[PDB]
Write an enzyme that holds these catalytic residues in place. Sequence first.
Site, mmCIF file in Angstrom:
data_model
loop_
_atom_site.group_PDB
_atom_site.id
_atom_site.type_symbol
_atom_site.label_atom_id
_atom_site.label_comp_id
_atom_site.label_asym_id
_atom_site.label_seq_id
_atom_site.Cartn_x
_atom_site.Cartn_y
_atom_site.Cartn_z
ATOM 1 N N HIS A 1 -2.740 -6.860 -1.321
ATOM 2 C CA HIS A 1 -3.189 -7.053 -2.697
ATOM 3 C C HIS A 1 -2.886 -8.470 -3.190
ATOM 4 O O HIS A 1 -3.800 -9.198 -3.584
ATOM 5 C CB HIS A 1 -2.564 -6.004 -3.625
ATOM 6 C CG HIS A 1 -3.033 -6.090 -5.044
ATOM 7 N ND1 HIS A 1 -2.583 -7.056 -5.920
ATOM 8 C CD2 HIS A 1 -3.906 -5.327 -5.742
ATOM 9 C CE1 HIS A 1 -3.165 -6.888 -7.095
ATOM 10 N NE2 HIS A 1 -3.970 -5.844 -7.014
ATOM 11 N N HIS A 2 -1.607 -8.851 -3.176
ATOM 12 C CA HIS A 2 -1.210 -10.214 -3.542
ATOM 13 C C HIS A 2 -0.073 -10.768 -2.679
ATOM 14 O O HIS A 2 0.726 -10.011 -2.124
ATOM 15 C CB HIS A 2 -0.880 -10.325 -5.047
ATOM 16 C CG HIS A 2 0.545 -10.013 -5.397
ATOM 17 N ND1 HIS A 2 0.910 -8.873 -6.079
ATOM 18 C CD2 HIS A 2 1.691 -10.704 -5.180
ATOM 19 C CE1 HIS A 2 2.219 -8.869 -6.259
ATOM 20 N NE2 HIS A 2 2.718 -9.966 -5.718
ATOM 21 N N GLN B 1 6.754 -13.149 -0.536
ATOM 22 C CA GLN B 1 6.668 -11.813 -1.107
ATOM 23 C C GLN B 1 5.259 -11.264 -0.933
ATOM 24 O O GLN B 1 4.290 -11.849 -1.422
ATOM 25 C CB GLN B 1 7.064 -11.827 -2.582
ATOM 26 C CG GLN B 1 7.050 -10.459 -3.243
ATOM 27 C CD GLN B 1 7.354 -10.525 -4.727
ATOM 28 O OE1 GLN B 1 6.543 -10.108 -5.554
ATOM 29 N NE2 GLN B 1 8.523 -11.058 -5.073
ATOM 30 N N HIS C 1 2.773 -7.908 -1.410
ATOM 31 C CA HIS C 1 2.564 -6.631 -2.076
ATOM 32 C C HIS C 1 1.554 -5.774 -1.322
ATOM 33 O O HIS C 1 0.369 -6.116 -1.237
ATOM 34 C CB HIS C 1 2.112 -6.843 -3.522
ATOM 35 C CG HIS C 1 1.704 -5.582 -4.219
ATOM 36 N ND1 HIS C 1 0.412 -5.349 -4.638
ATOM 37 C CD2 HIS C 1 2.413 -4.478 -4.555
ATOM 38 C CE1 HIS C 1 0.345 -4.160 -5.211
ATOM 39 N NE2 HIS C 1 1.545 -3.611 -5.174
ATOM 40 N N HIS D 1 2.176 -13.944 -15.936
ATOM 41 C CA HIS D 1 2.841 -12.735 -15.470
ATOM 42 C C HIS D 1 3.361 -11.857 -16.604
ATOM 43 O O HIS D 1 3.955 -12.338 -17.574
ATOM 44 C CB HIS D 1 3.954 -13.037 -14.458
ATOM 45 C CG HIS D 1 4.662 -11.810 -13.970
ATOM 46 N ND1 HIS D 1 4.015 -10.803 -13.285
ATOM 47 C CD2 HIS D 1 5.953 -11.417 -14.088
ATOM 48 C CE1 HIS D 1 4.878 -9.845 -12.996
ATOM 49 N NE2 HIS D 1 6.060 -10.192 -13.473
ATOM 50 N N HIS E 1 4.056 -7.167 -17.185
ATOM 51 C CA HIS E 1 3.934 -5.834 -16.588
ATOM 52 C C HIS E 1 2.872 -4.992 -17.325
ATOM 53 O O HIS E 1 2.019 -5.553 -18.013
ATOM 54 C CB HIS E 1 5.300 -5.140 -16.461
ATOM 55 C CG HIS E 1 6.333 -5.962 -15.748
ATOM 56 N ND1 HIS E 1 7.685 -5.707 -15.848
ATOM 57 C CD2 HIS E 1 6.216 -7.046 -14.944
ATOM 58 C CE1 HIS E 1 8.354 -6.590 -15.128
ATOM 59 N NE2 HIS E 1 7.486 -7.415 -14.571
ATOM 60 N N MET F 1 7.889 -8.440 -19.006
ATOM 61 C CA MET F 1 8.051 -9.874 -18.795
ATOM 62 C C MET F 1 6.907 -10.629 -19.453
ATOM 63 O O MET F 1 5.793 -10.113 -19.566
ATOM 64 C CB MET F 1 8.085 -10.203 -17.303
ATOM 65 C CG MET F 1 9.471 -10.245 -16.699
ATOM 66 S SD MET F 1 9.423 -10.411 -14.907
ATOM 67 C CE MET F 1 11.150 -10.748 -14.574
HETATM 68 CU CU LIG Z 1 -0.329 -7.168 -5.938
HETATM 69 CU CU LIG Z 2 7.718 -9.221 -13.422
#
Ligand SMILES: [Cu+2]
Ligand SMILES: [Cu+2]
Length: 307
Positions: free
Chosen positions: A61-62, A124, A126, A196, A198, A268
Amino acid sequence: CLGTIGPVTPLDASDFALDIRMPGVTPKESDTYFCMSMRLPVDEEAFVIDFKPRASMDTVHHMLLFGCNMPSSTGSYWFCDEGTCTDKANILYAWARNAPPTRLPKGVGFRVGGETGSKYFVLQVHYGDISAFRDNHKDCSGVSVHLTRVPQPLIAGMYLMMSVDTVIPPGEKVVNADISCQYKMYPMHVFAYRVHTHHLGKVVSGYRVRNGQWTLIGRQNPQLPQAFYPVEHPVDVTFGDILAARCVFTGEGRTEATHIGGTSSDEMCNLYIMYYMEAKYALSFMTCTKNVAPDMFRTIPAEANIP
Ligand SMILES: [Cu+2]
Ligand SMILES: [Cu+2]
Ligand code: NA
Ligand code: NA
Ligand code: NA
Ligand code: NA
Ligand code: NI
């Protein structure tokens, strides 16, 4: 997966590609965050002048790449629930499926290594839908990074704007997170932005204020692929300007108050402003957590309030 030739590919006398891949991971549950680190091969100062995404088009996904001196874990791979870096993580690159990543302009590079630059990369990845793994598969997805030790005429950096004290009451229709700082460095030139937030955030908007004039840097809905999006008109921010940002949240669908924090049930408000500077004036990272001109947010373009 690389194999017997390792993660370093020499490009010429002072250039090399460094493949930052997952050590053949296999997730367990739906929506998983895996993180892994790579010490830089060189101690001398170096310049990241290019990134190439090495990810499967049906499962990832990312992707996020960070530079920091203290990664969260020493393990081959770990869960990013344990965080990404103990110290401040400098984001260098983002990848999204629906958002084709923009490239760095030529002569622009992130300064890494040396005395002060980042000693580690943290990747990272996802993995959204794990149902795309009919069997174990074993995945080695990651980023290929172009390093050069040739000094770049322009140095890339990050100006991070974030909220710290935002408190979103339950069921509250609109809560704003305002952030503002005056710019006190040499000219920077913004060319990419990332937002960014949530699940509660509706819209995130970044501006430069000069003589009371709001100049748009980036305005995005945070529920869309949080990649690095390019700025239309390249914006200069100079000694005297005020950088202002506002995230618009809603408390609807919550039993308790939501504040700023690490977990999914927390919120966030981040705006990553990727800029460049003349190498001799350049600094790699700047941060704003203050809201020094809250009275200023009166003349904010109404566009920063509607979704
Ligand atoms: Cu993602
Ligand atoms: Cu976050
Ligand atoms: Na390249
Ligand atoms: Na995390
Ligand atoms: Na600090
Ligand atoms: Na909710
Ligand atoms: Ni300019």
